[PDB]
Design an enzyme around this catalytic site. Structure first.
Site, PDB file in Angstrom:
ATOM      1  N   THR A 159       0.819  -1.219   0.000  1.00 35.83           N
ATOM      2  CA  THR A 159       0.000   0.000   0.000  1.00 35.83           C
ATOM      3  C   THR A 159       0.860   1.280   0.000  1.00 35.83           C
ATOM      4  O   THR A 159       0.828   2.069  -0.953  1.00 35.83           O
ATOM      5  CB  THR A 159      -0.978  -0.051   1.177  1.00 35.83           C
ATOM      6  OG1 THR A 159      -1.849  -1.148   0.970  1.00 35.83           O
ATOM      7  CG2 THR A 159      -1.834   1.183   1.238  1.00 35.83           C
ATOM      8  N   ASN A 180       5.859  -2.192   3.658  1.00 37.56           N
ATOM      9  CA  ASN A 180       4.974  -1.721   4.700  1.00 37.56           C
ATOM     10  C   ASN A 180       5.671  -1.799   6.062  1.00 37.56           C
ATOM     11  O   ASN A 180       5.251  -1.135   7.018  1.00 37.56           O
ATOM     12  CB  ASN A 180       3.656  -2.482   4.696  1.00 37.56           C
ATOM     13  CG  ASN A 180       2.603  -1.882   3.735  1.00 37.56           C
ATOM     14  OD1 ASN A 180       2.615  -0.686   3.303  1.00 37.56           O
ATOM     15  ND2 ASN A 180       1.645  -2.736   3.411  1.00 37.56           N
ATOM     16  N   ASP A 261      -9.723  -2.909  -0.257  1.00 35.15           N
ATOM     17  CA  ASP A 261      -8.644  -3.662   0.341  1.00 35.15           C
ATOM     18  C   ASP A 261      -9.014  -4.347   1.682  1.00 35.15           C
ATOM     19  O   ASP A 261      -8.715  -5.538   1.884  1.00 35.15           O
ATOM     20  CB  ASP A 261      -7.418  -2.766   0.503  1.00 35.15           C
ATOM     21  CG  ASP A 261      -6.259  -3.457   1.211  1.00 35.15           C
ATOM     22  OD1 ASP A 261      -6.181  -3.398   2.448  1.00 35.15           O
ATOM     23  OD2 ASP A 261      -5.393  -4.038   0.552  1.00 35.15           O
ATOM     24  N   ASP A 308      -4.063   1.580  -5.915  1.00 33.83           N
ATOM     25  CA  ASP A 308      -2.667   1.348  -5.552  1.00 33.83           C
ATOM     26  C   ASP A 308      -2.148  -0.037  -6.005  1.00 33.83           C
ATOM     27  O   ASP A 308      -0.990  -0.156  -6.349  1.00 33.83           O
ATOM     28  CB  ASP A 308      -2.409   1.590  -4.076  1.00 33.83           C
ATOM     29  CG  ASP A 308      -3.356   0.783  -3.142  1.00 33.83           C
ATOM     30  OD1 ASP A 308      -4.230   0.033  -3.628  1.00 33.83           O
ATOM     31  OD2 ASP A 308      -3.234   0.978  -1.909  1.00 33.83           O
ATOM     32  N   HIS A 309      -2.995  -1.074  -5.991  1.00 35.90           N
ATOM     33  CA  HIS A 309      -2.579  -2.485  -6.270  1.00 35.90           C
ATOM     34  C   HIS A 309      -3.863  -3.312  -6.282  1.00 35.90           C
ATOM     35  O   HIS A 309      -4.877  -2.838  -5.812  1.00 35.90           O
ATOM     36  CB  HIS A 309      -1.569  -3.033  -5.211  1.00 35.90           C
ATOM     37  CG  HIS A 309      -2.050  -2.891  -3.806  1.00 35.90           C
ATOM     38  ND1 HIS A 309      -3.159  -3.572  -3.327  1.00 35.90           N
ATOM     39  CD2 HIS A 309      -1.608  -2.114  -2.783  1.00 35.90           C
ATOM     40  CE1 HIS A 309      -3.398  -3.186  -2.083  1.00 35.90           C
ATOM     41  NE2 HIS A 309      -2.471  -2.306  -1.724  1.00 35.90           N
ATOM     42  N   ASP A 684      22.463   0.229  -9.222  1.00 33.32           N
ATOM     43  CA  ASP A 684      21.633   1.481  -9.137  1.00 33.32           C
ATOM     44  C   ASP A 684      20.735   1.710 -10.363  1.00 33.32           C
ATOM     45  O   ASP A 684      19.980   2.702 -10.422  1.00 33.32           O
ATOM     46  CB  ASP A 684      22.508   2.717  -8.850  1.00 33.32           C
ATOM     47  CG  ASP A 684      23.480   3.048  -9.975  1.00 33.32           C
ATOM     48  OD1 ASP A 684      23.654   2.297 -10.969  1.00 33.32           O
ATOM     49  OD2 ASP A 684      24.093   4.118  -9.907  1.00 33.32           O
ATOM     50  N   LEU A 686      21.790   2.261 -13.378  1.00 29.97           N
ATOM     51  CA  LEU A 686      22.411   3.239 -14.222  1.00 29.97           C
ATOM     52  C   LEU A 686      23.762   2.735 -14.741  1.00 29.97           C
ATOM     53  O   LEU A 686      24.489   2.072 -14.021  1.00 29.97           O
ATOM     54  CB  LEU A 686      22.634   4.545 -13.426  1.00 29.97           C
ATOM     55  CG  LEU A 686      21.404   5.162 -12.734  1.00 29.97           C
ATOM     56  CD1 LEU A 686      21.901   6.341 -11.893  1.00 29.97           C
ATOM     57  CD2 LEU A 686      20.346   5.604 -13.739  1.00 29.97           C
ATOM     58  N   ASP A 688      27.425   1.972 -15.423  1.00 35.54           N
ATOM     59  CA  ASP A 688      28.690   2.204 -14.676  1.00 35.54           C
ATOM     60  C   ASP A 688      29.753   2.931 -15.510  1.00 35.54           C
ATOM     61  O   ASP A 688      29.881   2.676 -16.734  1.00 35.54           O
ATOM     62  CB  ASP A 688      29.311   0.849 -14.295  1.00 35.54           C
ATOM     63  CG  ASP A 688      28.507   0.098 -13.260  1.00 35.54           C
ATOM     64  OD1 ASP A 688      27.478   0.640 -12.727  1.00 35.54           O
ATOM     65  OD2 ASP A 688      28.922  -1.054 -12.988  1.00 35.54           O
TER      66      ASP A 688
END
Ligand SMILES: *[C@@H]1O[C@H](CO)[C@@H](O[C@@H]2O[C@H](CO)[C@@H](O[C@@H]3O[C@H](CO[C@H]4O[C@H](CO)[C@@H](O)[C@H](O[C@H]5O[C@H](CO)[C@@H](O)[C@H](O)[C@@H]5O[C@H]5O[C@H](CO)[C@@H](O)[C@H](O)[C@@H]5O)[C@@H]4O)[C@@H](O)[C@H](O[C@H]4O[C@H](CO)[C@@H](O)[C@H](O)[C@@H]4O[C@H]4O[C@H](CO)[C@@H](O)[C@H](O)[C@@H]4O)[C@@H]3O)[C@H](O)[C@H]2NC(C)=O)[C@H](O)[C@H]1NC(C)=O
Ligand SMILES: CC[C@@H](C)O/C(=C\c1ccc(Cl)cc1Cl)c1cccnc1
Ligand SMILES: [Ca+2]
Ligand SMILES: [Cl-]
Ligand SMILES: [K+]
Ligand code: NA
Ligand SMILES: [Zn+2]
EC number: 3.1.4.39
Length: 802
Positions: A159, A180, A261, A308-309, A684, A686, A688
């Site tokens: 959530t 959560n 939910d 949300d899901h 990350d 991204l 290197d």
């Protein structure tokens, strides 16, 4: 301490929150137990309920009532939402035909159409179809506005991670709310849904929409609602704020529903008890829309209805227990349920070993319902690793299952029939999007998209410049009538060199060997000058968006951009028609590697390093199997087409190149393929730089990729060949992890036809994921609009059924 003896008179749901110990009247005071003594009496009025009735019409204003039916209520902005219906013979908004909203139809003094976000916890995508008879208000929004068949949440499908992604446009790993439940080792603090710590500002990174609005001069209604404020009161508060004077009135508003939910946990996603919560949500929508119509705002406001899901069937009996696998079970802390996260119970235990934990949890039981991972080996599409709050050991749990530490945990803590949190590609986890209003399109269906993209669009709807985020701004321009964002292609930072023949065979000392007319010599020269390039490079060459040194190399069957720094292609591009034939590697060429006379010995790989490196072998980016002629096949064995590969990975790669490429060419009417290496040693997401590379082929400067990508493009209209396509494109891609074992695939000792394709599916990717990871920009030269190309680059092929 709160001096709870101030007063809420005229202060109810104050937009700006006051500082302790002067008491609070904001929609969050309840959660801090800091409300003034009279908050309930003044702000949470309930007398006479929530609807006008015939006998209440034109009544004497009684300030004790929950809402009003008196004459002055409209000017005061505090009528019951059905006032005009009951007392003025008006129709309910849901009963009115829909009519295109070409332009905002707003009261004087409105500077911009307000935005109202109505988010619903656990609203699974299929409820739109399966509950359609009991949700007439929501169905009108859906059919009259812009809608997707579903919207993809982020992982984990919990959530708070998803609601905070909606607000920021960021992956959980960047915004910091990674579950959560969480432990931050730098703070040495825990984060729990119940309680105090979660309100501390240090958990919440990025910049949420309400802060983006405030900083740029747009006023925002508060986004958090305390669970004990009833839904009718939330709606009436929003409608009241909308009646404020011009200088005080917010431009953005949020409503949040705990349903469906809350019920879905108790009864399962489609339990018969689920009809009622869906009816009650629809009724709330009806109240907002009737209230807006009363204020003449129903053709002025943009409304977003967003989940949300979703929710899946999950019961207590479907639990795997780590105590059935681990002897050491008390030396570990598990974050349990629909995902698993493992760390050491005590940092003072030097005998704890992640490696032996992983090994003890890998392929142990024939139908094992979870799979362990080092976080950096999780599919890249999940973007779930670059945060100190995410534990090194992760368990991806099968849909419909739970993981726990010991059986005592389950029966001493069957309650639940539904849960969520699983992989975000899973059908049951998908959620909803509907946009309705003057800025959205009329009666329009859009393809599925990810919830990370919405923050950009909410900024566009409000005239805001978005904070840096993980959306691709412009990729959702097709939802909007107006306020589109017109991006420009990033500028290429490095231009390529185009080397010719500059080196003699005998200048190369690489330990490589290979057992290797006027008409057909002008022919080979022209191929090397780029004569077939239009065939193999269909969408332009990728732009290199960072500073580096590289060469374009042309060949009969393929084109590559070769990096002098990493000693291998950054990208290799080739087209395989429906008709093309697979050949084998001839016997005389099995171990052939040939010097490339366009590229210096010093900028080349060498065979000796691979001979010396007992763990590392090599493969080819353009596959020899798909060469167009015996003579063109020699090009595939150039040292400039070679890349380092573990023998375990070669099994994968070889099957993709020998079997799967031809298969996709036959199914799709030709494919264009771009393949290459990826280096992401710090996980990350991204590209290197060279100083980040942690592994090299033994004794050499040849860097070892962490992953291999491919982008497979064809014509969306599959009656046109990939190389002669008139209209929109169709893409699928992957980022395969470059691993020295196949432990990830439990059936890998069987034939590649039983497990390789399943592995590739798991590691499906967006072209945009590959762009972050390589610093390249694809599709530079097409005949399509740039926004359409951005949508294509965010596409994910998920391999779930309907
Ligand atoms: C998804 O989109 C997001 C948003 O665009 C992308 O994330 C960005 O990526 C950038 C590159 O990684 C990164 O830029 C760095 O910013 C540093 C300044 O950081 C602060 O400021 C920002 C802006 O206000 C703020 O948002 C940051 O907040 C982070 O940290 C706190 C907790 O500490 C959290 O509350 C918050 O959620 C967020 O955490 C996330 O980001 C960090 C990385 O910053 C992760 O570590 C966390 O795990 C988490 O994921 C910050 O408060 C700046 O210091 C960096 O500069 C260094 O590197 C450059 C290279 O150019 C070098 O030139 C500089 O000199 C500097 O190096 C020096 O420090 C090094 C490390 O200490 C040291 O080794 C050297 O020797 C040097 O002396 C860098 O510019 C940006 O912060 C984030 N932004 C966000 C919001 O996450 C993300 O990449 C996208 N994902 C994908 C897949 O595309
Ligand atoms: C943790 C974020 C928090 C703000 O999320 C909530 C709503 C939300 C988030 C984003 C967007 Cl765009 C719209 C909404 Cl309505 C929320 C959660 C718990 C109680 N009340 C409200
Ligand atoms: Ca990296
Ligand atoms: Cl969690
Ligand atoms: K070797
Ligand atoms: Na295996
Ligand atoms: Zn839930």
């Amino acid at each position: 301490w709160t001096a709870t003896s101030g007063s809420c008179k005229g202060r109810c749901f104050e937009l700006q929150e006051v500082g302790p110990p002067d008491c609070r009247c904001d929609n969050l005071c309840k959660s801090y137990s800091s409300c003034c003594h009279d908050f309930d009496e003044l702000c949470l009025k309930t007398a006479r309920g929530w609807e006008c009735t015939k006998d209440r019409c034109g009544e004497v204003r009684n300030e004790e009532n929950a809402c009003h039916c008196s004459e002055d209520c409209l000017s005061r902005g505090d009528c019951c939402t059905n006032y005009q219906v009951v007392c003025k013979g008006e129709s309910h908004w849901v009963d009115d035909d829909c009519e295109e909203i070409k332009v905002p139809e707003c009261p004087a003094g409105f500077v911009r159409p307000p935005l109202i976000i109505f988010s619903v916890d656990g609203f699974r995508a299929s409820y739109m179809k399966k509950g359609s008879k009991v949700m007439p208000n929501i169905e009108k929004l859906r059919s009259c506005g812009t809608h997707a068949p579903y919207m993809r949440p982020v992982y984990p499908t919990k959530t708070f991670p998803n609601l905070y992604t909606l607000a920021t446009g960021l992956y959980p790993e960047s915004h910091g709310i990674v579950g959560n439940s969480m432990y931050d080792p730098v703070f040495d603090a825990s984060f729990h849904l119940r309680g105090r710590e979660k309100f501390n500002h240090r958990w919440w990174g990025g910049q949420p929409l309400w802060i983006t609005a405030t900083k740029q001069g747009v006023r925002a209604g508060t986004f958090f609602w305390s669970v004990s404020i009833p839904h009718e009161r939330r709606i009436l508060t929003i409608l009241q704020w909308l009646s404020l004077p011009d200088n005080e009135r917010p431009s953005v508003y949020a409503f949040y529903s705990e349903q469906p939910d809350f019920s879905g946990h108790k009864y399962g996603p489609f339990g018969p008890e689920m009809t009622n919560p869906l009816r009650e949500i629809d009724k709330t929508v009806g109240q907002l829309m009737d209230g807006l119509k009363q204020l003449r705002l129903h053709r002025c406001v943009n409304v977003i209805f967003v989940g949300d899901h979703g929710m899946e069937d999950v019961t207590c009996d479907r639990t795997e227990f780590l105590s059935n696998y681990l002897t050491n079970v008390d030396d570990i802390t598990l974050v349990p349920g629909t995902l698993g996260r493992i760390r050491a119970k005590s940092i003072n235990n030097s005998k704890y070993d992640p490696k032996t934990i992983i090994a003890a949890l890998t392929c142990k039981k024939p139908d094992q319902h979870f799979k362990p991972y080092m976080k950096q080996h999780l599919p890249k599409r999940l973007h779930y690793a670059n945060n100190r709050r995410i534990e090194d050991i992760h368990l991806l749990v099968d849909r419909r299952w739970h993981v726990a530490r010991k059986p005592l945990d389950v029966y001493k803590k069957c309650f639940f029939q539904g849960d969520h949190g699983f992989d975000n590609k899973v059908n049951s986890m998908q959620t909803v999007f509907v946009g309705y209003g003057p800025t959205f399109k009329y009666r329009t269906k859009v393809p599925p998209f990810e919830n990370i993209e919405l923050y950009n669009v909410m900024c566009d709807l409000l005239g805001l410049k978005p904070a840096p985020n993980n959306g691709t701004h412009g990729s959702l321009n097709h939802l909007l009538r107006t306020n589109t964002f017109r991006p420009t292609m990033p500028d290429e930072v490095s231009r390529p060199n185009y080397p010719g023949i500059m080196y003699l065979q005998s200048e190369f000392d690489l330990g490589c060997t290979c057992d290797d007319n006027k008409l057909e010599e002008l022919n080979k020269r022209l191929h090397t000058k780029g004569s077939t390039k239009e065939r193999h490079l269909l969408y332009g060459r990728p732009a290199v968006l960072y500073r580096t040194s590289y060469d374009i190399l042309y060949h009969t069957d393929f084109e590559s951009g070769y990096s002098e720094i990493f000693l291998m292609p950054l990208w290799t591009s080739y087209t395989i028609s429906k008709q093309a034939e697979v050949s084998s590697i001839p016997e005389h060429l099995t171990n052939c590697v040939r010097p490339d006379v366009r590229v210096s010995p010093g900028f080349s790989q060498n065979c000796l390093a691979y001979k010396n490196d007992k763990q590392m072998s090599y493969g080819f980016l353009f596959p020899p199997y798909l060469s167009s002629s015996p003579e063109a096949k020699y090009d595939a064995f150039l040292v400039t087409n070679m890349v380092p590969m573990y023998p375990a990975f070669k099994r994968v790669w070889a099957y993709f190149q020998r079997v799967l490429v031809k298969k996709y060419a036959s199914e799709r009417n030709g494919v264009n393929v771009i393949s290459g290496p990826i280096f992401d040693y710090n996980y990350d997401g991204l590209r290197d730089t060279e100083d980040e590379i942690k592994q090299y082929v033994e004794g050499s400067s040849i860097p070892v990729p962490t992953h291999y990508y491919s982008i497979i493009t064809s014509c969306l209209d599959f009656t046109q060949p990939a190389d002669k396509c008139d209209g929109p494109l169709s893409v699928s891609s992957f980022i395969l992890p470059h691993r020295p074992d196949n432990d990830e695939s439990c059936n890998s000792s069987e034939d590649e036809s039983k497990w390789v394709e399943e592995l590739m599916k798991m590691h499906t990717a967006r072209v945009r994921d590959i762009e972050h990871l390589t610093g390249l920009d694809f599709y530079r030269k097409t005949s399509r609009s740039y926004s359409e190309i951005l949508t294509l680059k965010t596409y994910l092929h998920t391999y779930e059924s309907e």
